[PDB]
Swiss-Prot record, chain A:
Function in brief: May be involved in pre-mRNA splicing. May confer protection against toxicity induced by heavy metals such as arsenite, possibly by negatively regulating the expression of phase II detoxification genes such as gcs-1 in intestinal cells.
Phenotype upon gene inactivation: RNAi-mediated knockdown results in increased sensitivity to the heavy metal arsenite.
Location relative to the cell: Nucleus
Record's protein name: Pre-mRNA-splicing factor syf-2
Gene: syf-2
Domain of life from the UniProt record: Eukaryota
Family of the protein in this entry: Belongs to the SYF2 family.
Length: 49, 69, 69, 186, 313
């Protein structure tokens, strides 16, 4: 649970910090992560019997 | 929800008519601003401002009534 | 991060062009402030001025040989 | 593989080969290669949008400018001008010619300044006057330029003939003004 | 050689090794550690290719540390090898792609800086590429201006060929600025004609009024007419009223009073007089000024029809 919470608080305070800076967190977040992180995210996101 | 198509009557001053108007206007404007003078300039009118005065006088216009009913 | 650098360059659009209120005036310039040749005429000028300078140089030789007799 | 594709397929296909070639070369190539493929793409692109319409004069003015800017061979720049010129406006009204006529003027300017073949440049200017209707409207532009082109090469006896016929066929105020100004300068 | 709980734990050990060597000025050893850390395993190099030591070379922390030492202590060509390999492996973040281009640009390798941006765009999918395209397109213009314009066009077209409509607003205005100051006039206008349909509905009016202003600024209010009629037919009803008021103001200030009515009469069916009272005021002022007894009765007729479009409910 703690480990799970560490990612949660990390992203949330980073969002807060990004929001405090007046920057779109999602752009700033995507600036840091590798393309592999995007690729797993892009994978995750009646014509006939 | 739904809206009609915008339909407008054809302009009275067509584009080809306006071309002639601006041709005359630019010539008449140019020959005014071409030249001034120290005493004999009072023969000239300041045409462009008088044209503005004439245009605002002509700006009141109305559609006619009583042709039928 | 300088997360908006493109906005520094397009500012002249954002301030005066991205919004405008209204106008209620007319004049012979406002009816036609440029003419449809203008960009083609613009891109000829840097070439056509070379012809102009050559024309002054050419006409000077025509005169010089016509007065040499 | 990309070059083999472009060499062996008609350019109505190859748009995928081109866009991917100008991806591959645009990363893994180098400047002289990157610009070469983008020019060949653009020439193909203009050539397409010319075939789509012909009267897309702005496609010609770009295409002519591109070929002139890249210093391409005279025969090919001259040929494409001839294709431009065949798009005579289907109208007797000067409004539609006002944009068109700079194809002729630029062709003469190219022939006089860049090719430096003044006999060919004369043929360009002459062919303008055989195309303009003159009775319904005239361009003083071409008559003034053709007159001054014969003031260059020191042939005022031709320039006077050209400009006097302009007065003869079509008295127009800029034609008088420009001829008078020429005779003052002489 | 030992076990760890995860890649990030091990990567910190590699960094801590090079870190101490760098502080002790063993810069060539520090690079050697990073080279030895970052070497991609061949498929036989480990007992399994999913062990922590076999995956640690994918950690971006490790490559970031390596590339930074090469910038500080290596040759320019060696830095390109590090960054290019980092791009090859998908490791490079958009930020450190922009660091790579900054490095080449700072060393005046401007043309290689554009290849760095170019493969940045090949890796990432929107919106991730958005700040790569931003820095690329402003730097290219600042480097070359009009001297490479047909290549500049290909960047903007390549950008806008996949740009979404929430981000495209700035790119269209940046692209129009290029074509405005160096290009042919109809090209800039064609960008605006694209912009007022490629930008999303919530800001599409802010693209129409640009196109209105720029056409009006050069071809005047006569040629401006057709692009008002596109606007009125297309932007959402609150702005379609606003365009109708502005369009009617032009046709009255010109003197096409009959066209002015048809603008109002066309807007009046999407303008509830019980709430939009300022519209009906502007039309009422118009019809008492430029109208007559017959057309005022027609204004009041349509007013009492459109209120009856709601009160019966
Ligand atoms: O013949 P004018 O009454 O003297 O007018 C001419 C003429 O205008 P139009 O023939 O269109 O009526 C020129 O047109 P061209 O004969 O060269 O086709 C035009 O040149 P543009 O078409 O390039 O505008 C020129 O204007 P400008 O003085 O700016 O060269 C203008 O001359 P004036 O202004 O001296 O009357």
């Amino acid at each position: 649970k703690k480990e799970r919470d560490q990612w949660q608080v990390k992203e949330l305070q980073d969002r807060k910090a990004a929001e405090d800076k007046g920057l779109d967190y999602e752009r700033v977040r995507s600036l840091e992560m590798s393309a592999d992180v995007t690729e797993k995210l892009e994978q995750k996101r009646f014509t006939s019997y | 929800k739904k809206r009609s198509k915008l339909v407008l009557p054809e302009p009275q001053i067509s584009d080809r008519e306006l071309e002639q108007i601006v041709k005359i206007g630019h010539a008449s404007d140019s020959v005014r601003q071409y030249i001034d003078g120290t005493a004999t300039s009072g023969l000239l009118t300041d045409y462009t401002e008088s044209a503005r005065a004439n245009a605002v006088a002509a700006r009141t216009m109305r559609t006619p009534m009583l042709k039928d009913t | 991060m300088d997360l908006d650098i493109v906005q520094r360059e397009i500012t002249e659009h954002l301030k005066d062009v991205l919004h405008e209120k209204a106008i209620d005036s007319v004049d012979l310039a406002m009816l036609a402030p440029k003419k449809i040749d203008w960009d083609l005429k613009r891109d000829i000028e840097s070439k056509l001025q070379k012809l102009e300078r050559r024309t002054q140089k050419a006409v000077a030789t025509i005169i010089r040989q016509r007065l040499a007799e | 593989i990309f070059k083999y594709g472009l060499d062996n397929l008609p350019s109505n296909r190859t748009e995928e080969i081109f866009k991917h070639y100008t991806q591959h070369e645009k990363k893994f190539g180098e400047r002289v290669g990157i610009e070469d493929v983008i020019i060949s793409k653009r020439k193909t692109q203009y050539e397409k949008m010319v075939e789509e319409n012909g009267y897309n004069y702005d496609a010609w003015f770009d295409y002519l400018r591109l070929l002139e800017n890249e210093e391409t061979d005279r025969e090919e720049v001259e040929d494409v001008y001839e294709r431009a010129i065949a798009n005579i406006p289907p109208h007797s009204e000067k409004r539609y010619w006002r944009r068109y006529i700079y194809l002729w003027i630029n062709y003469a300017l190219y022939e006089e300044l860049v090719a430096k073949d003044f006999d060919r440049a004369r043929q360009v200017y002459k062919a303008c006057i055989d195309i303009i209707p003159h009775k319904t409207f005239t361009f003083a532009k071409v008559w003034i330029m053709f007159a001054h082109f014969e003031i260059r090469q020191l042939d005022l006896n031709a320039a006077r003939k050209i400009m006097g016929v302009a007065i003869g066929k079509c008295p127009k105020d800029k034609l008088f003004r420009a001829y008078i100004d020429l005779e003052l300068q002489l | 050689i030992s076990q760890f709980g995860g890649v990030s734990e091990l990567a910190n050990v590699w960094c801590a090794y090079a870190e101490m060597e760098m502080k002790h000025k063993r810069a060539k050893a520090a690079l050697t550690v990073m080279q030895r850390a970052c070497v991609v395993p061949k498929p036989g190099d480990y007992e399994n290719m999913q062990s922590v030591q076999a995956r640690v070379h994918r950690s971006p922390i490790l490559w970031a540390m390596y590339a930074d030492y090469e910038e500080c202590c290596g040759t320019v060509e060696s830095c390109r090898k590090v960054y290019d390999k980092m791009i090859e492996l998908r490791v490079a973040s958009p930020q450190m792609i922009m660091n790579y281009a900054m490095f080449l640009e700072e060393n005046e390798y401007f043309e290689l800086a554009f290849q760095a941006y170019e493969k940045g765009i090949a890796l990432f999918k929107w919106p991730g590429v958005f700040d790569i395209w931003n820095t690329y397109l402003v730097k290219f213009i600042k480097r070359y201006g009009g001297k490479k314009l047909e290549r500049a066009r290909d960047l903007f077209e390549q950008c806008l060929e996949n740009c979404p409509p929430t981000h495209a607003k700035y790119i269209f205005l940046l692209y129009a600025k290029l074509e405005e100051e160096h290009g042919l006039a109809r090209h800039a206008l064609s960008i605006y004609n694209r912009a007022c349909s490629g930008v999303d509905r919530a800001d599409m009016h802010s693209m129409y009024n640009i196109y209105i202003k720029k056409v009006q600024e050069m071809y005047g209010i006569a040629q401006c007419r057709p692009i008002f009629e596109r606007a009125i037919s297309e932007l959402p009803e609150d702005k379609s009223r606003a365009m109708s008021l502005r369009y009617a103001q032009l046709e009255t200030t010109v003197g096409e009073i009959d066209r002015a009515r048809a603008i109002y009469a066309h807007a009046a069916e999407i303008s509830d007089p019980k709430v939009h009272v300022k519209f009906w005021d502007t039309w009422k002022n118009f019809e008492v000024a430029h109208g007559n007894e017959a057309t005022v009765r027609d204004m009041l007729r349509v007013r009492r029809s459109v209120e009856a479009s709601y009160n019966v409910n």
